[PDB]
Amino acid sequence: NQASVVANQLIPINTALTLVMMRSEVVTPVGIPAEDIPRLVSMQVNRAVPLGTTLMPDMVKGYAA
Numbered sequence: 123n124q125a126s127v128v129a130n131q132l133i134p135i136n137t138a139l140t141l142v143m144m145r146s147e148v149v150t151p152v153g154i155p156a157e158d159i160p161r162l163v164s165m166q167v168n169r170a171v172p173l174g175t176t177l178m179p180d181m182v183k184g185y186a187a
Contacts, residue, residue, distance in 0.1 A: 123148055124148075126153045126155060139167065144159055144162070151176065158185075162185055
């Protein structure tokens with residue numbers, strides 16, 4: 123079971139991510155892993171991502187693979 127980066131807090135659109143708005147939890151589908159948690163710091167999202175939402179790389183502008 124691979125853990126992904128789920129939203130730990132209410133992340134609004136046009137806003138940067140933070141350690142507080144990130145956590146390691148199992149979810150579906152298998153998106154971004156919890157290994158690049160510090161690499162996806164202060165990353166602006168294309169849309170609004172609420173709590174309990176798999177963080178994908180396609181949505182994260184700048185983050186690829």
